[PDB]
Each structure stands twice: as structure tokens, then as C-alpha cells.
């Protein structure tokens, strides 16, 4: 029952192809719930999960105002950062930002986050104390000095401990049937010969939510870390996620191998075997 909210901002310049594009998305855990795209025919915050749609016109207008101001602010930031690095007006560059709050199973604020990056590299981050900054280089120190003058950290701290938490808890109550429901993985094991003397055992996890899962293979009750091919957890497209883990084993030492599954949705951790 641990929960979090995050907003993700991407601002991208594109010299010769108009003004920089700004897009914001918001998530509770692995569920996206809002988007805004400065490129959209009519730029406005749009709902992306059913439980947010009940919010009134003043919510939507409020979000849209902030994202419209951010679109313009981030356009100036891109100009500023290109200068800080002595970069030419010809290349395309990206500012990213992620921020939000974590709650424990009691619904109390575990910690807040606010981090920004430039061209995929850490640039500036709010420290866990929510009162000071870590700047990555001399360019980021200029941003740090501007941000101290506007008392940004103080503003973030009031938001992260206050509104962020209060709205997260509202979303969690409004979307409780999905947001607070864990769906356990459906699991099986497949066997495929690779040669006469070896076969692939593949342990499958499907239909689970949230995305966090652990899948491991053991040989005689010990971890097979270096020998497991582990695929990135992937979205099914219906809110749920999928993962598999595979090992190549000698024929027929198949029964010495066990797949282990841990997920919040499960009554109990699972131990599975190939069942010929």
C-alpha cells in the first residue's frame, strides 16, 4: 500500500522547426492520469484515466494555466542553458524534469523529489531535506543561484508536504478500485530444445499491476543471476504488465531448476517448475 505521484516534463528545442515543444504527463504509481502537449491542435490538459474525469472545470483550467506558463518558462530555460554551455544555435536540446511525493502504507509523506536534467544528464536536484540543491556543474550553479533568489526550494517544500500529498490521497480514494488493487501475475513455465543436450526454460509473468515484480531462477536452491536472461518489464496496454526470465539448462537436469515469483498481488510467493 505504498504510493507515489510524479509529474514528468520534457522540453525540446528544434531549431528551424518552430518553437520548443513542451509536454507534461502525471502519474499515480504506474497509472498515467493527465497530459498536456504544447503541440496539440488546442493545447489543454486532458484526462488519461477515468477517475480524474470527475474533477471540475476549475481543476482543468488551473492545470492548463500552469502548463501554459511552463511552456514559455522552459523556452527561456532552453535559451539560457544553451548559453551556459556555449552551444551553437544549430543543435536540438532537451530539458527534463521529474518531481513528486512518496507516501508510506500509512498515507504519510515518506519523501519528496524534484530533479532536472539536460540532454539526458543530471543537472540540478533538490536534496532530500527539501531545503538545498545539488548542482552538477558550473552551469547548474547559475541555475542554483537563480533558484535560491526566487526561494524555489521553500516553495517546493510547501507543495511536496502539502498539496502534493493531499491531492495524491484524493486520487487514491477516487480511483481506489484500480489504484489500490494489486493484480497478481498469471504465471507458467515453457520448455524449448536449443540442441540435443540443452533446453530453454522460460518463466512467464502476465497480467500483473503494479509493474514492480521479482522473477528469479534457481538451480538446487541457489540464485542463477549471471545465467538468467531477464527481459525488461513491459506494458500489456490494458494497465497490466508482463515479464519473463529464461535459463538454458542441461537435458534433463530440468527438475533441479525453480522459478521464483514475488509480487504485491499474490497471496504467497510462488515457486514454479517445468511440468512436462
Amino acid at each position: 500500500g505504498s504510493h507515489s505521484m510524479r509529474y514528468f516534463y520534457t522540453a525540446m528545442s528544434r531549431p528551424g522547426r518552430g518553437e520548443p515543444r513542451f509536454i507534461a504527463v502525471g502519474y499515480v504509481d504506474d497509472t498515467q492520469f493527465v497530459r498536456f502537449d504544447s503541440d496539440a491542435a488546442s493545447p489543454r490538459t486532458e484526462p488519461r484515466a477515468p477517475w480524474i474525469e470527475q474533477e471540475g472545470p476549475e481543476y482543468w483550467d488551473r492545470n492548463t494555466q500552469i502548463f501554459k506558463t511552463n511552456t514559455q518558462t522552459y523556452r527561456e530555460s532552453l535559451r539560457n542553458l544553451r548559453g551556459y554551455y556555449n552551444q551553437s544555435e544549430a543543435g536540438s536540446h532537451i530539458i527534463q524534469r521529474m518531481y513528486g511525493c512518496d507516501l508510506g502504507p500509512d498515507g504519510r509523506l515518506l519523501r519528496g523529489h524534484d530533479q532536472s536534467a539536460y540532454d539526458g544528464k543530471d543537472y540540478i536536484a533538490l536534496n532530500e531535506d527539501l531545503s538545498s540543491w545539488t548542482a552538477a556543474d558550473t552551469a547548474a550553479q547559475i541555475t542554483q543561484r537563480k533558484w535560491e533568489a526566487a526561494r524555489v526550494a521553500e516553495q517546493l517544500r510547501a507543495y511536496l508536504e502539502g498539496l502534493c500529498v493531499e491531492w495524491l490521497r484524493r486520487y487514491l480514494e477516487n480511483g481506489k478500485e484500480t489504484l489500490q488493487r494489486a493484480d497478481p501475475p498469471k504465471t507458467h513455465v515453457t520448455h524449448h530444445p536449443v540442441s540435443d543436450h540443452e533446453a530453454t526454460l522460460r518463466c512467464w509473468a502476465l497480467g500483473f499491476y503494479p509493474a514492480e515484480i521479482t522473477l528469479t531462477w534457481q538451480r538446487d536452491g541457489e540464485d542463477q543471476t549471471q545465467d538468467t536472461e531477464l527481459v525488461e518489464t513491459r506494458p500489456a496496454g490494458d494497465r497490466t504488465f508482463q515479464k519473463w526470465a529464461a535459463v538454458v539448462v542441461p537435458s534433463g537436469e530440468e527438475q533441479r531448476y525453480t522459478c521464483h515469483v514475488q509480487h504485491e498481488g499474490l497471496p504467497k510467493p510462488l515457486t514454479l517448475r517445468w511440468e512436462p
Binding site: 506558463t69 522552459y74 502534493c164
Partner: peptide, 9 residues
């Protein structure tokens, strides 16, 4: 609900 202030970097 998102953070209300935008600040130029």
C-alpha cells in the same frame, strides 16, 4: 495536481 510555480533556469 502539479506544482504551481514555473521558474526560469
Amino acid at each position: 495536481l502539479p506544482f504551481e510555480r514555473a521558474t526560469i533556469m
